Design an enzyme around this catalytic site. Structure first.
Site, mmCIF file in Angstrom:
data_model
loop_
_atom_site.group_PDB
_atom_site.id
_atom_site.type_symbol
_atom_site.label_atom_id
_atom_site.label_comp_id
_atom_site.label_asym_id
_atom_site.label_seq_id
_atom_site.Cartn_x
_atom_site.Cartn_y
_atom_site.Cartn_z
ATOM 1 N N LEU A 1 27.136 45.034 41.606
ATOM 2 C CA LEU A 1 26.684 45.143 40.211
ATOM 3 C C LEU A 1 27.729 44.606 39.217
ATOM 4 O O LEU A 1 27.404 43.860 38.284
ATOM 5 C CB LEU A 1 26.313 46.602 39.891
ATOM 6 C CG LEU A 1 25.162 47.179 40.738
ATOM 7 C CD1 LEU A 1 25.022 48.690 40.551
ATOM 8 C CD2 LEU A 1 23.858 46.464 40.392
ATOM 9 N N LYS B 1 29.324 53.802 30.672
ATOM 10 C CA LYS B 1 29.262 52.696 29.705
ATOM 11 C C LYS B 1 28.642 51.449 30.379
ATOM 12 O O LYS B 1 29.171 50.952 31.385
ATOM 13 C CB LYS B 1 30.680 52.375 29.198
ATOM 14 C CG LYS B 1 30.788 51.072 28.425
ATOM 15 C CD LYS B 1 32.236 50.784 28.015
ATOM 16 C CE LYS B 1 32.367 49.379 27.406
ATOM 17 N NZ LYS B 1 33.762 49.023 26.970
ATOM 18 N N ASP C 1 30.662 41.744 27.266
ATOM 19 C CA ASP C 1 31.359 42.064 26.026
ATOM 20 C C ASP C 1 32.121 40.859 25.481
ATOM 21 O O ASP C 1 33.196 40.524 25.979
ATOM 22 C CB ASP C 1 32.331 43.239 26.260
ATOM 23 C CG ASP C 1 32.995 43.738 24.962
ATOM 24 O OD1 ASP C 1 32.543 43.359 23.854
ATOM 25 O OD2 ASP C 1 33.969 44.526 25.053
ATOM 26 N N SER D 1 34.094 40.680 15.793
ATOM 27 C CA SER D 1 35.535 40.852 16.023
ATOM 28 C C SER D 1 35.692 40.242 17.425
ATOM 29 O O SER D 1 36.048 40.918 18.392
ATOM 30 C CB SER D 1 35.890 42.348 16.051
ATOM 31 O OG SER D 1 35.455 43.031 14.875
ATOM 32 N N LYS E 1 36.466 38.224 20.922
ATOM 33 C CA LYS E 1 37.570 38.217 21.887
ATOM 34 C C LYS E 1 38.189 36.832 22.067
ATOM 35 O O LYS E 1 37.579 35.817 21.723
ATOM 36 C CB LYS E 1 37.067 38.661 23.267
ATOM 37 C CG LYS E 1 36.787 40.137 23.417
ATOM 38 C CD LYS E 1 36.405 40.471 24.859
ATOM 39 C CE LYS E 1 36.091 41.953 24.992
ATOM 40 N NZ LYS E 1 37.241 42.799 24.598
ATOM 41 N N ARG F 1 32.033 40.572 32.276
ATOM 42 C CA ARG F 1 30.731 40.745 32.914
ATOM 43 C C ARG F 1 30.750 42.116 33.628
ATOM 44 O O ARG F 1 29.702 42.675 33.958
ATOM 45 C CB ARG F 1 30.454 39.620 33.938
ATOM 46 C CG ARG F 1 31.336 39.612 35.200
ATOM 47 C CD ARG F 1 30.968 38.418 36.092
ATOM 48 N NE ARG F 1 31.894 38.185 37.208
ATOM 49 C CZ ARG F 1 33.043 37.511 37.118
ATOM 50 N NH1 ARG F 1 33.447 37.015 35.947
ATOM 51 N NH2 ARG F 1 33.799 37.339 38.198
ATOM 52 N N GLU G 1 33.211 48.700 21.024
ATOM 53 C CA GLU G 1 31.796 49.033 21.166
ATOM 54 C C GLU G 1 31.452 50.086 22.223
ATOM 55 O O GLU G 1 30.413 50.745 22.138
ATOM 56 C CB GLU G 1 30.981 47.751 21.412
ATOM 57 C CG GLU G 1 30.891 47.277 22.875
ATOM 58 C CD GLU G 1 32.233 46.911 23.512
ATOM 59 O OE1 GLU G 1 33.120 46.355 22.823
ATOM 60 O OE2 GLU G 1 32.384 47.161 24.729
ATOM 61 N N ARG H 1 32.826 53.012 22.821
ATOM 62 C CA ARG H 1 32.786 54.357 22.259
ATOM 63 C C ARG H 1 31.557 54.547 21.371
ATOM 64 O O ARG H 1 31.027 55.659 21.250
ATOM 65 C CB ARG H 1 34.099 54.705 21.542
ATOM 66 C CG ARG H 1 34.386 53.900 20.294
ATOM 67 C CD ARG H 1 35.866 54.027 19.881
ATOM 68 N NE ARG H 1 36.729 53.161 20.687
ATOM 69 C CZ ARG H 1 38.058 53.110 20.590
ATOM 70 N NH1 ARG H 1 38.708 53.899 19.733
ATOM 71 N NH2 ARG H 1 38.743 52.277 21.365
HETATM 72 C C1 LIG Z 1 39.700 44.770 28.616
HETATM 73 C C2 LIG Z 1 38.449 45.637 28.423
HETATM 74 C C3 LIG Z 1 38.621 46.930 29.203
HETATM 75 C C4 LIG Z 1 38.143 45.894 26.935
HETATM 76 C C5 LIG Z 1 36.899 46.763 26.635
HETATM 77 N N1 LIG Z 1 35.696 46.101 27.160
HETATM 78 P P1 LIG Z 1 36.732 46.917 24.818
HETATM 79 O O1 LIG Z 1 36.721 45.467 24.219
HETATM 80 O O2 LIG Z 1 35.350 47.576 24.563
HETATM 81 O O3 LIG Z 1 37.908 47.791 24.283
HETATM 82 ZN ZN LIG Z 2 34.842 45.420 23.348
HETATM 83 ZN ZN LIG Z 3 28.134 42.284 36.124
HETATM 84 ZN ZN LIG Z 4 33.914 47.019 26.168
#
Ligand SMILES: CC(C)C[C@H](N)P(=O)(O)O
Ligand SMILES: [Zn+2]
Ligand SMILES: [Zn+2]
Ligand SMILES: [Zn+2]
Ligand SMILES: CC(C)C[C@H](N)P(=O)(O)O
Ligand SMILES: CC(C)C[C@H](N)P(=O)(O)O
Ligand SMILES: [Zn+2]
Ligand SMILES: [Zn+2]
Ligand SMILES: [Zn+2]
Ligand SMILES: [Zn+2]
Ligand SMILES: [Zn+2]
Lengths: 484, 161, 484
Positions: A170, A250, A255, A260, A262, A271, A334, A336
């Site tokens: 997954l 979660k 993401d 904002s 990355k 993924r 996101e 949280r």
């Molecule tokens: C590197 C990773 C664990 C960041 C989380 N996905 P976040 O962007 O939600 O803090």
């Molecule tokens: Zn994030």
């Molecule tokens: Zn995946």
């Molecule tokens: Zn995240």
């Protein structure tokens, strides 16, 4: 053709030579001492996790791989917080099976090595590879127990390992295939396959709206991919009304950070931002397969976090299911946001315990890396149960602080009741945990930040490079013991 | 032991290697070191508590109990071979002064120190996160904090009794 | 324990089985076909570069490692610009020797594999490891030719590989040990041990001053470490007056960037910023060992580039030996500054050719990586000789342009005759070469930018991870052919 994996221990001070396992000595006798003879001729003794291959010893086993098991009586290591013997077995058997696969042999028989469950875990976890999308693949190896005496234990190991491998599949699958809908459908088929005492609800956007999950909805709207709230039940208790244990994970299928946004480097690993959902759902599937006598509910909000003309904007204020307002200062915090709504909903089941898992913060990785999953909890009893389970599985957990000190930094908010990012940059995993706590009133809650254990390079010997599926087995073990 | 200095700013562990070695010459009952060692410790726990890495649960418990009394808290951090492996993997020498990865910076730093310790009751306190105070500890004005001095004094008082 | 490495080729269409080398079949015959029988039992055929180990086949060789050599008639590959057969042999033999070492066997005999020089090169280059400063080291392996028929060819390979290994040692050694003075002393001892027809002069700062090498001196002043100008002569021609070939090498023992300071990440690799000096000096030592009938002069300005209260400051203007003024806009573009003075001095010998080597630009790494050394030359005859030599050694070269287009961007200067950095970031390696050209009037000059081949991870199969010492062998081959 068929291969054979056999174990040998490190020589003890009083011993004249290193001792084979019961199966190793039996094979040596079967071949009139040729195994001991050839091992002696080959040179230096085999240490823990190392391997050596001998050919043509017997007509039925053209390739025999001997693996080093370490000290025979290695038990719980008080410094490492794990059963060392089991870890030695897992690593050695995995290395042995990889050698057989490199020789392109389709079937392998495996020495139980004094602990068939650990042996099976090493074989099944060690051979795993996500290669569905590749044209060139390694030979598919079918591993089986050498002998029949310890079959029940072997089968148990295969079960625990299979649960973790489902989590790995997954997590590893690319996000354009592993969408919120696809994830839910795979979990559904596996859970129904595991037991008829189950119920699956793949809740659509309309339900999410009726439930007033504004925080979760704010994250999902930026993408065109439909969000879903996965709700699964396993009714294992003899008493239908027995309060359930609730698990929350979660489920961010991808993401990008949203507005904002990355940085590009290694963003592909995002993924696996649905690892929390993968580990808790797989643990539940396994608990069902085991027929554990307990009631369990799994909750997994699933969606993508993408930038667009309708995405969350920094400074926006959203309303969670409990009516509490949240100032979204950073759209990339996101996890949280979606968990706030899932945790509120978790209380409606009047649970005995609430446990959530999430690849929540990069800060957790900076804190402990892949050494252990960070555990934040308001219950020392719960911490101890998770810790004890981890000693058995080898998939370690380490406690992190749940102090008001951190809460103060998230409730200091310009526009709302709580801010989605702390006032300062220090202790990111702790302030994230504090945020989650503002949506929990239960006396036995535990939050597992698994961000640092999302992947494996070669730290855990028995897992090839890729998504790790940690700490699935620790959750399965926790559930098993809890039921007893 | 030879050390490969890959990053000159990871200097704390370099000076501590020699001091820890010298500490063994006194045939001590316990060895406790304190250092503003890593930014990673600040990212980990901030000013909430001092990170403690120790090979003795008896020693961890004495420090923990003392902190409850003083209010200047401590929190245990892991001493695992998992981290040691990342610092002994070295191109030129016995140990590298920085880990092969950024993950677990405070833990790999502790693992480096451990390569210079053979004592059964050793504790390393990474106080980088509690170096300063803004408003977290109500009774300390903004500035350098001097933490966890009182916790060490309490530990000594109790030990002497 | 005594080990043996034997080769086997890939099977051709009309062959019934893959063919062993002469040595392989001789050993198979000696053991009445047991080598073929066990290889067959072990499974799938051995492809190029792969290995398999068989134990107890003969009392004198408890461990026999068979290695895949690929296609037997593999010659010059017109697409890759190298002799494929030789590259296959170097890779296979290195792999076999590494396995012997893992088994902790101290001596191994190696199949010449139809090309003893290539076999020796794979063994000597493959086994090398810089471990002088470690307490824990692998077993020292003594590799020797299997048989007595190709002794000269085998030793030629040992000599070529040893030259490259000296270069690797010099590059790998930490800068606090490998200072300008230490480098000069080590090269001095090796050259003198190679031949009595040699002269070495470790020129001190006072000589550098007398020679008016202001550009070189400007770089050196920032550090407390004394600079030196290494000058070596190999008098191999029958005719003492025969004009010499001149080699020049960049000797920055450590490059911190100076006032224009480098970033921290991986700055440790800058201990190898003296690689140009290492490769050219090592090639000369080897030419002397071979007693090639030619006169050769080696020149290597050596110093550190450090920040301090007396270091080069951006904007400073310095005067080279030839009177040209240079505007030092970036103190980290120091290689071209020290080379300006060395190239000027090279003309005083009325040489036949002038060849310099330097880990000059990060741009060269972005351009070709470790695939090939970049060569800028004003002579197509010279380019062709270097190219032909590289085909034989496998340590490839690739031509880069010397156009006025690039010169224009370095002579456009606010304060002086030439600027040490171009007006743009584009074509960094080309503008750097253009800068060097402003200090050269010779008709047969070649500049080798070896920045991209400074290190090896896994690209060249027969070199372990670390400093590469490339392209030492290509320079030796060029000298051998030139002398004939
Ligand atoms: C590197 C990773 C664990 C960041 C989380 N996905 P976040 O962007 O939600 O803090
Ligand atoms: Zn994030
Ligand atoms: Zn995946
Ligand atoms: Zn995240
Ligand atoms: C922020 C501070 C605690 C860093 C340490 N002085 P280091 O540079 O030695 O890691
Ligand atoms: C990466 C390396 C080759 C850079 C050169 N030493 P420079 O700083 O002199 O360009
Ligand atoms: Zn520092
Ligand atoms: Zn410091
Ligand atoms: Zn060096
Ligand atoms: Zn530089
Ligand atoms: Zn340089």
């Amino acid at each position: 053709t068929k291969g054979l994996v056999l174990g040998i221990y490190s020589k003890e001070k009083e011993e004249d030579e290193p001792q084979f396992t019961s199966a190793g000595e039996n094979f040596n006798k079967l071949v009139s001492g040729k195994l001991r003879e050839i091992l002696n001729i080959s040179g230096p003794p085999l240490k823990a996790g190392k391997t050596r291959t001998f050919y043509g010893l017997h007509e039925d086993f053209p390739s025999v791989v001997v693996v080093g098991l370490g000290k025979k009586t290695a038990g719980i290591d008080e410094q490492e917080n794990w059963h060392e013997g089991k870890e030695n077995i897992r690593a050695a058997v995995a290395a042995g099976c990889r050698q057989i696969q490199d020789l392109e042999i389709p079937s392998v028989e495996v020495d139980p090595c004094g602990d068939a469950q650990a042996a099976a875990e090493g074989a099944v976890l060690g051979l795993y590879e996500y290669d569905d999308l590749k044209q060139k693949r390694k030979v598919v190896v079918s591993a089986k127990l050498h002998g029949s005496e310890d079959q029940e234990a072997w089968q148990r190991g295969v079960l625990f390992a299979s649960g973790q491998n489902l989590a790995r599949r997954l997590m590893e699958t690319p996000a354009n295939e592993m969408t919120p809908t696809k994830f839910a459908e795979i979990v559904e088929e596996n859970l129904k396959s595991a037991s008829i005492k189950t119920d699956v609800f793949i809740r659509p956007k309309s339900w999410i709206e009726e439930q007033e999950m504004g925080s979760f909805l704010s994250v999902a709207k930026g993408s065109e991919e439909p969000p879903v709230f996965l709700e699964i039940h396993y009714k294992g208790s003899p008493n239908a009304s027995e309060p359930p244990l609730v698990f929350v994970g979660k489920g961010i299928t991808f993401d990008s950070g949203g507005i904002s946004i990355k940085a590009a480097a290694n963003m592909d690993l995002m993924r696996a931002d649905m690892g929390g959902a993968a580990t808790i759902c797989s643990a539940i599937v396994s608990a069902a397969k085991l027929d554990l006598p307990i009631n369990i509910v799994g909750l997994a909000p699933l969606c993508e976090n993408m930038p667009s003309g309708k995405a969350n904007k920094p400074g926006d204020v959203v309303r969670a299911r409990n009516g509490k307002t949240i100032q979204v200062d950073n759209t990339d915090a996101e996890g949280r946001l979606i968990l706030a709504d899932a945790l509120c909903y978790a209380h409606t089941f009047n649970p005995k315990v609430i446990i959530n898992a999430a690849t929540l913060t990069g800060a957790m990785d900076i804190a402990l890396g892949s050494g252990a999953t960070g555990v934040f909890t308001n219950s020392s009893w719960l911490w101890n149960k998770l810790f004890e389970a981890s000693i058995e599985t080898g998939d370690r957990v380490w406690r992190m602080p749940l102090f008001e000190h951190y809460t103060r930094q998230v409730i200091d908010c310009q526009l709302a009741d709580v801010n989605n990012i702390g006032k300062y940059r220090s202790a990111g995993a702790c302030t994230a945990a504090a945020f989650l706590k503002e949506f929990v009133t239960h006396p036995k809650w535990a939050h597992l930040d698994i961000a640092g254990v999302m992947t494996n390079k070669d730290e855990v010997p028995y897992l090839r490079k890729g998504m790790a599926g940690r700490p699935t087995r620790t959750l399965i073990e926790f559930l098993f013991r809890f039921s007893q």
